Design a protein around this ligand. Structure first.
Ligand SMILES: *[C@H]1CC(=O)[C@@H](O)[C@@H](O)CCCc2cc(O)cc(O)c2C(=O)O[C@@H](C)C1
Length: 341
């Protein structure tokens, strides 16, 4: 097999490998697809020693083999050994993009037109995801891929779940859904992250970061995150506190000194006022008052792009030991075997 930095065993269809970045359970390489005559991205996955790794791998494969959308990076091919006995790694082949938004924001200032088009595409893909009754649950700049003409695709469905709003409530300081800087305040207070509003919060964080090239809520550790959120939003209203029935969470908030809201136009003095109006609606403390994806698409900031007939939804929404998970991954990837069927 061809090797990179480890086995990267994708041949002979895929050749001339170059290291790019990293997935969760392995490295990402670009490669030349000798059949389609285009370069592609390939993610190496080694999940089978651990249930949780197997879960995340299987979840993504199940979701992406059903999803088809311009703003979601799909699965082009899956490479693995012909038998469960010989299967150790799994390689997922996807479109080769130019960069991710994390890397881009490290050095490039976005024009307002770029922010608008990027945000439109994030929400257009998110509309499709949410219409399938699925939550991405880890939206962040490094999961947003851009090609050379600034078309955007959402990556990594390994953390996704089927939405379950009726079972979303939990206790205080127990949940860790999403990546810290993009994590909604209710995750720390009373939410398992099973409602669509979790993703809208993350998109609001991404919008703020596109406006200034810095994370808006850069918590330095799990417990610091809520300090940053409340430092900008200010103290929650009585009505929003009354919506938090859990006593530990509500009394924690009641114990805090009053904090003023920081106006968005003072944080972002060069931003488009329509962008800040939408930002405010996405970064609303109360998840029931937070804007939903279809409302966000219809917001005046996005009026140059908004077209509900060109914002498709999913045809087939989702309704609901590692040894069996390995077997399930083997079965779910069978369609890509050369002599599959
Ligand atoms: C996309 C999700 C993922 O694994 C994240 O860690 C991303 O940040 C990794 C991005 C790798 C990458 C980088 C470039 O420049 C281009 C492309 O196409 C990718 C890519 O496709 O990725 C996916 C394999 C994973």
């Amino acid at each position: 097999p061809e090797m990179v930095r480890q086995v990267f065993d994708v041949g002979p269809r895929y050749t001339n490998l170059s290291y790019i970045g990293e997935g969760a359970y392995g490295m990402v390489c670009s490669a030349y697809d000798n059949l389609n005559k285009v370069r592609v991205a390939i993610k190496k996955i080694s999940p089978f020693e651990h249930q949780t790794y197997c879960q995340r791998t299987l979840r993504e494969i199940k979701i992406l083999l059903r999803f088809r959308h311009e703003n979601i990076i799909g699965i082009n091919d899956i490479i693995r050994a012909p038998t469960i006995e010989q299967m150790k790694d799994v390689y997922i082949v996807q479109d080769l993009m130019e960069t991710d938004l994390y890397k881009l924001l490290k050095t490039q200032h976005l024009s307002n037109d770029h922010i608008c088009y990027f945000l439109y595409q994030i929400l257009r893909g998110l509309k499709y995801i949410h219409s399938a009754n699925v939550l991405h649950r880890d939206l962040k700049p490094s999961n947003l891929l851009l090609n050379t003409t600034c078309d955007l695709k959402i990556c990594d469905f390994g953390l996704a779940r089927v939405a379950d709003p009726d079972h979303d409530h939990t206790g205080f300081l127990t949940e860790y859904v999403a990546t810290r800087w993009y994590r909604a305040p209710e995750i720390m207070l009373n939410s398992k992250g099973y409602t669509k509003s979790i993703d809208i919060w993350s998109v609001g964080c991404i919008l703020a970061e596109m406006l200034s090239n810095r994370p808006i809520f850069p918590g330095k550790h799990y417990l610091d995150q809520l300090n940053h959120i409340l430092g900008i939003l200010g103290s929650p209203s009585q009505e929003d506190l009354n919506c938090i029935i859990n006593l530990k969470a509500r009394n924690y908030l009641l114990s805090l000194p009053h904090k003023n809201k920081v106006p968005w136009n003072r944080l972002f003095p060069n931003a488009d006022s329509k962008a800040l109006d939408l930002l405010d609606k996405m970064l609303t403390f109360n998840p029931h008052k937070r804007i939903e994806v279809e409302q966000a698409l219809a917001h005046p900031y996005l009026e140059q792009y908004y077209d509900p007939s060109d914002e498709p939804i999913a045809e087939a929404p989702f309704k609901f030991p590692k040894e069996k998970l390995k077997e399930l991954i083997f079965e779910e990837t069978a369609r890509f075997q050369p002599g599959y069927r």
